[PDB]
Amino acid sequence: GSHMASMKKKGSVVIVGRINLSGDTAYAQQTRGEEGCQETSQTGRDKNQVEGEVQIVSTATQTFLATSINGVLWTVYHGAGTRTIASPKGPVTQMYTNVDKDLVGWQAPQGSRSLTPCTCGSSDLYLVTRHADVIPVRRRGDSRGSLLSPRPISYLKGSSGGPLLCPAGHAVGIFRAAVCTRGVAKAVEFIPVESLETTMRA
Ligand SMILES: CC(C)(C)[C@@H]1NC(=O)O[C@@H]2CCC[C@H]2OC/C=C/C(F)(F)c2nc3ccccc3nc2O[C@@H]2C[C@@H](C(=O)N[C@]3(C(=O)NS(=O)(=O)C4(C)CC4)C[C@H]3C(F)F)N(C2)C1=O
Ligand SMILES: [Cl-]
Ligand SMILES: [Zn+2]
Does the annotation flag 120 for ligand binding? yes
Ligand 1 pocket, residue 102 CB under 6 Å: yes
Q: Relative to the alpha carbon of 100, which ligand is closest?
A: 1
Residue bearing the CA closest to ligand 1, atom 25: 102
Torsion of CA 74, 79, 82, 87, to 10 degrees: -60
Residue bearing the CA closest to ligand 1, atom 1: 180
Torsion of CA 133, 152, 136, 114, to 10 degrees: -50
Q: Which CATH number fits domain 124-200: 1.10.10.10, 2.30.110.10, 3.40.50.2000, 2.40.10.10?
A: 2.40.10.10
| Burial annotation 134-160 (CB, 10 A radius, 16+ → b, else e) | ebebebeeebbbbbeeeeebebbebbb
Distance 191 CA to ligand 2 centre (A): 5
Q: Which of 64, 98, 160, 164 to mutate to test the pocket of ligand 1 (most atoms within 8 A of CB)?
A: 160
Q: Which residue in 135, 131, 138, 155 sits closest to 54, CA to CA?
A: 131
Whether the CB-CB separation of 156 and 140 falls below 8 Å is answered with no
Pairing type for strands 72-76 and 103-107 reads: antiparallel
Specify the fold of 14-107. Answer: Thrombin, subunit H (2.40.10)
CA distance 75 to 7: 27
Distance of CA 199 to the CA centre of its chain: 16
Domain ranges of the chain: 14-107, 124-200
CA distance 116 to 160: 19
Q: Which residue in 199, 197, 155, 148 sits closest to 172, CA to CA?
A: 197
Q: How was this structure determined?
A: X-ray
Q: Relative to the alpha carbon of 121, which ligand is closest?
A: 3
Distance 4 CA to ligand 1 centre (A): 33
Q: Which residues are catalytic?
A: 78, 102, 160
